[PDB]
């Protein structure tokens, strides 16, 4: 259930737009191609089988799909941990990217990260 998931990951997870998925926290603003401080995780709340692929894509109006690195992970015990997810493509100072999560169940489910993310050459 959701109480167990929160008891296994206390004060680490946050909501997505989808009631079936939670995720780890990402920085609001980060350096282009820099290693993340918290490794990305997608936690499923339903019965998602082991080996189910999760893919993340970043984008806005002027860039439908910004370049990423290691944007795919496999589900194991309801968690899909991204080994070294990095944001290469840059939103610039004027815009932020919306981060969309796709969990490849039959049929696939699409979820959105709760905040937009700003990606610049220097970062904060
Ligand atoms: Cl790009
Ligand atoms: Cl920039």
Describe the structure.
This protein has a single domain, classed as Immunoglobulin-like, CATH 2.60.40.720. The chain is 6% helix and 38% strand. It has one helix spanning 2-8; strands at residues 14-15, 21-23, 29-31, 41-44, 53-60, 63-66, 68-69, 72-74, 79-81, 86-87, 98-103, 109-112, 118-120. Strands 5, 6, 8, 11 and 12 form a 5-stranded antiparallel sheet that branches. The structure holds chloride ion (2 copies). One chloride ion binds at residues 63, 66-67, 89. The PDB classes it as transcription. Keywords: transcription factor, transcription/DNA, chloride binding, acute myeloid leukemia, transcription regulation, transcription, nuclear protein, phosphorylation, AML, runx1, IG fold, runt domain, DNA-binding. The assembly is monomeric.
Gist of the model:
By secondary structure, the chain is mainly beta.
- CATH 2nd-level architecture: Sandwich
Provide the list of bound ligands, each named once: chloride ion
What are the secondary-structure elements, in order, as H or E? HEEEEEEEEEEEEE
Q: Work out the helix count.
A: 1
Q: Which fold does the CATH topology refer to?
A: Immunoglobulin-like
